[PDB]
């Protein structure tokens, strides 16, 4: 849907079937999915020493 | 959130005004917009039932 | 649902596509290997209070 931008009375909205870009035929599925890169190496303090 | 190695099956349908054979919303009609006070951006509406 | 975003007393109504090319103004889809453009003006003209 597309909502038309009247400078009109504010009590009403008119919606029209939007035509739309081709992407939206499957952006309607890919809303639920995100992709991430693992960062498997990390550092943190504790009280130990390497032996020398 | 759940991690997964692959998506569910997504079918490459093509259409303009109405979305066909795609996935239905879980409980109720859901309506999605990028920034709803902007007329240039389409509202996507996803149904709960199909309509045949 | 639209009533939640725009407010309960809004007189929401639908209308058909305004004008321009067949490909952008109509349903533009394939059935069975054949390409259909269909005039959705029958669906989109309800009005609500």
């Amino acid at each position, epitope marked *: 849907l597309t*909502r*038309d*931008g*009247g*400078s*009109t009375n*504010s009590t009403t909205e008119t919606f029209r079937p939007g*035509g739309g870009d081709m992407r939206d035929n499957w952006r309607s599925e890919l809303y639920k999915y995100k992709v991430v890169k693992i960062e498997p190496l990390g550092v943190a303090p504790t009280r130990c020493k390497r032996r020398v | 959130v759940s991690t997964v190695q692959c998506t569910h099956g997504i079918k490459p349908v093509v259409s303009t005004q109405l979305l066909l054979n795609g996935s239905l919303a879980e409980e109720e009609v859901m309506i999605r917009s990028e920034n709803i*006070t*902007n*007329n*240039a951006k389409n509202i996507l509406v996803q149904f709960n039932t199909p309509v045949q | 649902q639209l009533r939640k975003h725009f407010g309960n007393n809004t007189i929401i109504r639908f209308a058909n*596509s*305004s*004008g*321009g*090319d067949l490909e*952008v*103004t109509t349903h533009s889809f394939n059935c069975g290997g054949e390409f259909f453009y269909c005039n959705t003006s029958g669906l989109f003209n309800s009005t609500w209070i």
Partner: antibody, heavy 122, light 111 residues
Framework: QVQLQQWGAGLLKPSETLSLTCALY????????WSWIRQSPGKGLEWIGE???????YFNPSFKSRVAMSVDTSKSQFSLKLNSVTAADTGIYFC????????????????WGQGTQVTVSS | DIQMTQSPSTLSASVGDRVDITCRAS??????LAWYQQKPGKAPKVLIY???????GVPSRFSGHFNGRESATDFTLTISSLQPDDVATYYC????????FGQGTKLEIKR
């Protein structure tokens, strides 16, 4: 019912400041921007800028160095001031209703005042 | 900035004729255009907005046309059956950015 009326200075000498008042009837300024537009026979129509009930503004770049606008939501009024007028500022000036706040692409001017004629001469 | 070119500059036709006025944006305006009628010595009045919708109180003989696609540049106002009252100056105007009017077209009736 919704309308505006406007008035102010008719004759100005060069380098003076123009000042014009616009008053609404039958509604408040909220929910819309408001603008001034002017006509001169050498240029057709020019948009000057815009204001709102919050008194924030945005101005057409060529005017931003000379223009000011103000609002008075208690009187249902807004106004325009234009510094350092020259013969080229001669014309008819109209205040008009602009875009509505909940529709970011709606800046086309639905209602206009009767307009006022400004002559800039000695 | 984005600027509007009208064509023709002046026009004449007789009562009951169709009349067409055109406007072209200097680059694509997605559909954010309006048309105005000005009587001599009066404020303009809006006729059409979003290139194609009628304003309220416009007689249904007025109409807008354009190719509909989101990259449009070329727009038309068609007076589908001219009447004695339609003698006026007509301006297009975009609102993609700052509002810019076209130079206006004048229509005078043949009798």
């Amino acid at each position: 019912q919704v309308q505006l009326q406007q008035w102010g200075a008719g004759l100005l000498k060069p380098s003076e400041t123009l000042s014009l008042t616009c008053a609404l009837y039958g509604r408040s300024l909220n929910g819309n921007y408001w603008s001034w537009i002017r006509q001169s026979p050498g240029k057709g129509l020019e948009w000057i800028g815009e204001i709102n009930h919050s008194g924030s503004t945005y101005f057409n770049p060529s005017f931003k160095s000379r223009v000011a606008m103000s609002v008075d939501t208690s009187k249902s009024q807004f106004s325009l001031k234009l510094n350092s007028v020259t013969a080229a500022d001669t014309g008819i000036y109209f205040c008009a209703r602009g875009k509505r706040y909940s529709a970011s692409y709606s800046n086309y001017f639905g209602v206009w005042g009767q307009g006022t004629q400004v002559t800039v001469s000695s | 900035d984005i600027q509007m070119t009208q064509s023709p500059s002046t026009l004449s036709a007789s009562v009951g004729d169709r009349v067409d006025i055109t406007c072209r944006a200097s680059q694509s305006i997605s559909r954010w255009l309006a048309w105005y009628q000005q009587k001599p010595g009066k404020a303009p009045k809006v006729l059409i907005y979003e290139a194609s919708l009628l304003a309220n109180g416009v007689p249904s003989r007025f109409s807008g046309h354009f190719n509909g696609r989101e990259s449009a540049t070329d727009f038309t106002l068609t007076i589908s059956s001219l009447q004695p009252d339609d003698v006026a100056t007509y301006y297009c105007q975009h609102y993609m950015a700052d509002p810019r009017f076209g130079q206006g077209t004048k229509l005078e009736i043949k009798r």
